[PDB]
Design a protein around this ligand. Structure first.
Ligand SMILES: COc1cc(C(=O)c2cc(C)cc(C)c2)cc([N+](=O)O)c1O
Ligand SMILES: COc1cc(C(=O)c2cc(C)cc(C)c2)cc([N+](=O)O)c1O
Lengths: 116, 116, 116, 116
């Protein structure tokens, strides 16, 4: 609800299904602490990562396991993973969607931040 | 239903709302004939462009009026518009989503083609 | 020199070699008139399309023949071409680099505009 | 020479000048060790990060300091940085160009890998 991840595949023209996604929150000692994770669904979406109560301001990292995704499809990939790092800021009501568009040697990411 | 367009804004991190979208189908004489049009909604999506009966195989052009979108936001843009040209092919049941991610001097587009 | 095109391949992580590019300019009667054409080199770059004298103000369309590129590599891609449409030189001469990053179901384009 | 980074700005249509870039290499104990750093020139390019001798096999992370770039232009961007993580030189030496295209709420990255 506060945070959704969506992953698309630029080679096949499809959602990127069954991609592992790990979210971390930066701790006080600057290390990355596990926060939430899951696998994208048949629509390429990963819902239910967190709740409003749990998702406080801070620095988050979303790691998308692109390498395993490509290897499951039999395609040779460049990256280890894709990492999206951002600050969550409570500037009134907000929902964050982190979207990624994957190719073997490239990826694109955007944030769609809306007031629900 | 068979064809949806979604437009996102990379500068503001938001759906691209109220963007005009024109779809054309290539005619026998190679000209582009108007086929469907609309404006993206508050979610950046444009539904209801066509129906299964109307959307036959052929070459289609989706023109996204990016210049007017940026000017309504007070941002100076490079492109006249963004044009996505593709062939619709009846390889079993298919839904097409044409997605575009806009910046003033760049855009990205992908096709998400799924079997419903 | 005033207009260069660069094309990269996001599947292979390489320049996109031997990509045909056609440039058109909108004529007074609103049709697209041929302006220049060429193909990308081993570096993915296409230089020498035009000259400072010939590259006057106007609305230009750079058509990158992405389908032909993919088909020659044995791939069936989604798009027919990538088209980049922009007004050039409207505040005096500029140098334009039009870049494209290709995948079978997606492309991205950017413009770099410099004042010489 | 074996590792170059190029950064472009999708808002202005320009090279992204004075962008700080930090490269790390995974050490035997799985931590990220500093490897090289620099900043992009007026062309948006960063050359001379490393040498053929120093750029051995390994897992490398190229951190592009996009937030610092935007903040110096007076813009509040979404991401903290753009990180590009890849195994290099695993089948012998290659030349790598890591490119990034920046917007306030989005970025794209690609790799061009060539065999010298
Ligand atoms: C929020 O919802 C959506 C977002 C996006 C996107 O941000 C995106 C992101 C990138 C990097 C490229 C494109 C062309 C688009 C695509 C979607 N889509 O269904 O293709 C979508 O639904
Ligand atoms: C000028 O020279 C180059 C330009 C560019 C680019 O404009 C570009 C364009 C797009 C759509 C995405 C990215 C990440 C970058 C990439 C290059 N490259 O090596 O990936 C390159 O050499």
């Amino acid at each position: 609800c506060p945070l959704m991840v969506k992953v698309l595949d630029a080679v096949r023209g499809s959602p990127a299904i069954n991609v592992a996604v790990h979210v971390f929150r930066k701790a006080a000692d600057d290390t990355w602490e596990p926060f939430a994770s899951g696998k994208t669904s048949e629509s390429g979406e990963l819902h239910g990562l967190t709740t409003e109560e749990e998702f406080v301001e801070g620095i988050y990292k979303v790691e998308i396991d692109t390498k395993s995704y490509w290897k499951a499809l039999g395609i040779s990939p460049f990256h280890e993973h894709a990492e999206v790092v951002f600050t969550a800021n409570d500037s009134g009501p907000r929902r964050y969607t982190i979207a990624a568009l994957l190719s073997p040697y490239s990826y694109s990411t955007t944030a769609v931040v809306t007031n629900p």
